Amino acid sequence: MKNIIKILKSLSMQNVLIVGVGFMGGSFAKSLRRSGFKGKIYGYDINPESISKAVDLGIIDEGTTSIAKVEDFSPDFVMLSSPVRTFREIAKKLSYILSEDATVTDQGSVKGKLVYDLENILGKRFVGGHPIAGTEKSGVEYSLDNLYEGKKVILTPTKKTDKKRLKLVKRVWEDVGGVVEYMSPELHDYVFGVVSHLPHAVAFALVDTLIHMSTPEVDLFKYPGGGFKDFTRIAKSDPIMWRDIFLENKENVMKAIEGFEKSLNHLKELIVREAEEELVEYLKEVKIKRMEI
Amino acid sequence: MKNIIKILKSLSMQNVLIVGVGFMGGSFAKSLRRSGFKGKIYGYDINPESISKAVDLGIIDEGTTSIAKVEDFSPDFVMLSSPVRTFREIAKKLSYILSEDATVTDQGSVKGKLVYDLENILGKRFVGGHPIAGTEKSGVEYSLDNLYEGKKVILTPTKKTDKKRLKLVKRVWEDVGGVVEYMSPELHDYVFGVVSHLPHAVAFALVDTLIHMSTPEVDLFKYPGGGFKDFTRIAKSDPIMWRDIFLENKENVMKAIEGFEKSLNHLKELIVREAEEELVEYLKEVKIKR
Numbered sequence: 001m002k003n004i005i006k007i008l009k010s011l012s013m014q015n016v017l018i019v020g021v022g023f024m025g026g027s028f029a030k031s032l033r034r035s036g037f038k039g040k041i042y043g044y045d046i047n048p049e050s051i052s053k054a055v056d057l058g059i060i061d062e063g064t065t066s067i068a069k070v071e072d073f074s075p076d077f078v079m080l081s082s083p084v085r086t087f088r089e090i091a092k093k094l095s096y097i098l099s100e101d102a103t104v105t106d107q108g109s110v111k112g113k114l115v116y117d118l119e120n121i122l123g124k125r126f127v128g129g130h131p132i133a134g135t136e137k138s139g140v141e142y143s144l145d146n147l148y149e150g151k152k153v154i155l156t157p158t159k160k161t162d163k164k165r166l167k168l169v170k171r172v173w174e175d176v177g178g179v180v181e182y183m184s185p186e187l188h189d190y191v192f193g194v195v196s197h198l199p200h201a202v203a204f205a206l207v208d209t210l211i212h213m214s215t216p217e218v219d220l221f222k223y224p225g226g227g228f229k230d231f232t233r234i235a236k237s238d239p240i241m242w243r244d245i246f247l248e249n250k251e252n253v254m255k256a257i258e259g260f261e262k263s264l265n266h267l268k269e270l271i272v273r274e275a276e277e278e279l280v281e282y283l284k285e286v287k288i289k290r291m292e293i
Numbered sequence: 294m295k296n297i298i299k300i301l302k303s304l305s306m307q308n309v310l311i312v313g314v315g316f317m318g319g320s321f322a323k324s325l326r327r328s329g330f331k332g333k334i335y336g337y338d339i340n341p342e343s344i345s346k347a348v349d350l351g352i353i354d355e356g357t358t359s360i361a362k363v364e365d366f367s368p369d370f371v372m373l374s375s376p377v378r379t380f381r382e383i384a385k386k387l388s389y390i391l392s393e394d395a396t397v398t399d400q401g402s403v404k405g406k407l408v409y410d411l412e413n414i415l416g417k418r419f420v421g422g423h424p425i426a427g428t429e430k431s432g433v434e435y436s437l438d439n440l441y442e443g444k445k446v447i448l449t450p451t452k453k454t455d456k457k458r459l460k461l462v463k464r465v466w467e468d469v470g471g472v473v474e475y476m477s478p479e480l481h482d483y484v485f486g487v488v489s490h491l492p493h494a495v496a497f498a499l500v501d502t503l504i505h506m507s508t509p510e511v512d513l514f515k516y517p518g519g520g521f522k523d524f525t526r527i528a529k530s531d532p533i534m535w536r537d538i539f540l541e542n543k544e545n546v547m548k549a550i551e552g553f554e555k556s557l558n559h560l561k562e563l564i565v566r567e568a569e570e571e572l573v574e575y576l577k578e579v580k581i582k583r
């Protein structure tokens with residue numbers, strides 16, 4: 001009698017649309033299936049090969065490249081997984097196709113104003129999210145059915161978020177193994193501006209530095225074993241994605257670089273003043289914090 | 294020809310002194326012993342714990358915390374492996390205590406004027422070296438008997454360098470796995486200023502940024518490897534080692550940081566001014582084959 005928590009659960013989400021059928025879109029589709037989801041998974045992509053590869057791999061049941069065909073799929077759950085620069089335009093087009101009862105959510109690596117813009121486009125259907133997962137992979141062929149297990153997923157509810165959709169999006173992420181927490185859109189963009197965007201910005205600029213400080217007689221790239229090695233991981237990054245993340249989170253990325261410049265300026269001062277003991281303590285305190293994890 | 298070359302090497306290294314018995318001094322001691330070396334290995338260190346640990350692990354035959362006692366060791370081959378600013382005053386002491394025929398070399402991460410200062414203190418005894426190998430760990434407990442295997446070692450001979458000792462030091466490094474090349478002391482300090490000292494300075498400051506940008510309600514350290522973790526492994530390195538390197542190589546470290554800043558400033562402006570094409574071109578630089 002009371003056990004019918006089960007039926008509500010099955011009826012809460014029946015036709016799922018993956019927008020952007022790439023690595024993240026496909027890892028989500030796969031992880032969703034692996035958690036025992038029995039409904040339909042549909043794909044929408046501008047690249048018909050993304051759809052082609054995902055269907056034959058069994059990752060979606062069917063898909064399309066015409067936005068207007070999406071309507072035939074009557075999705076009630078949408079996971080935005082294209083580049084974040086596409087989200088506004090696509091959400092414009094979903095806003096008419098989707099029933100008032102649909103839920104839209106996303107995996108976008110930036111939140112901030114984008115969440116407010118998406119909720120204004122989509123009314124009440126929208127819940128912002130960011131799974132702190134990722135690797136340096138692209139394309140559905142690389143999608144993993146456990147990408148999210150044991151990782152943080154940040155949802156960014158507002159005063160406008162629908163509590164039952166927030167709660168569903170939370171539960172769907174936990175079914176795939178994620179650990180959910182909440183941050184405002186603005187706090188999210190500050191936090192990840194600092195812990196994620198800044199570190200990439202600074203790896204980018206390091207590479208640029210070794211290029212202009214090399215001379216015709218000296219290729220500095222020949223000497224990676226002195227500390228530069230870990231920074232060369234930046235070679236695996238996608239320049240277009242970073243370009244878009246930098247632009248979209250510009251105000252937080254600039255604040256983060258600013259606080260970085262303050263830290264580096266402090267280190268220069270200790271160096272030039274030969275502050276022997278201060279310099280040790282500066283390095284010791286960063287040592288301890290970095291070791292905690 | 295091999296027999297003899299080997300005899301000569303043996304005889305010229307009966308008594309090795311490791312000065313600073315920590316991660317690099319221990320790695321050197323273990324590497325030498327793994328390579329089949331048969332003489333004595335002694336340790337001298339300011340920390341008595343460094344000595345007893347190294348003895349207990351069978352890394353050195355014997356050691357001491359008194360520089361005077363080094364004379365009883367009659368070292369003929371000394372590998373300086375303490376923090377780089379300890380070298381001058383240690384050398385001064387050694388010059389009285391070591392025989393004229395001994396070789397003194399080093400593992401320090403800075404060369405530059407220190408090579409010259411050390412040649413003036415030690416005379417013909419001295420050969421400047423720097424193995425480009427290490428991790429963030431420090432202390433003899435972390436040392437490894439294959440640390441230098443297949444790694445570059447830079448020697449910095451000058452006008453004044455004794456050729457026999459240069460050949461000796463080179464073959465010792467190649468014996469433990471290293472691949473030797475030469476640079477001038479000054480070229481060394483500019484190369485490694487940019488490629489090793491600046492990336493460390495950058496990693497340290499990155500972690501420091503998360504400290505001050507944190508609030509009591511938001512601990513930025515709860516969110517690591519949004520990529521931070523990968524780029525700051527080297528910010529767990531030793532504060533004394535790194536304080537010494539930054540001060541000893543101060544002018545190059547400043548020149549490297551100034552270079553970096555101009556790159557960072559270029560990047561900022563591309564971001565601020567939303568230059569889609571130029572920004573993506575700048576970022577594409579990580580794809581270069583070098």
Ligand SMILES: NC(=O)c1ccc[n+]([C@@H]2O[C@H](COP(=O)([O-])OP(=O)(O)OC[C@H]3O[C@@H](n4cnc5c(N)ncnc54)[C@H](O)[C@@H]3O)[C@@H](O)[C@H]2O)c1
Nearest residue numbers: 020021022023024046050081082084108109134135138139
């Ligand atoms: N890669 C990561 O480490 C990572 C981590 C966390 C979050 N994210 C987020 O995941 C999203 C996509 O990332 P990905 O790594 O899967 O990229 P991806 O390259 O693997 O795939 C994106 C897919 O979107 C499709 N696409 C591109 N433009 C489109 C448009 N106009 N309409 C519909 N589809 C379009 C592509 O054709 C491709 O099939 C981004 O929003 C990114 O911020 C990525």
Ligand SMILES: NC(=O)c1ccc[n+]([C@@H]2O[C@H](COP(=O)([O-])OP(=O)(O)OC[C@H]3O[C@@H](n4cnc5c(N)ncnc54)[C@H](O)[C@@H]3O)[C@@H](O)[C@H]2O)c1
Nearest residue numbers: 313314315316317339340343375377379401402427431432
């Ligand atoms: N750690 C690395 O990656 C690495 C790589 C290449 C070169 N180096 C250079 O190696 C040398 C040793 O570094 P490490 O990583 O072995 O450091 P470490 O902390 O592991 O060891 C340093 C040792 O020297 C001792 N010491 C400190 N002051 C001394 C003094 N006044 N006299 C005698 N001993 C003293 C300490 O007690 C300790 O046992 C430094 O010059 C460093 O720049 C380090």
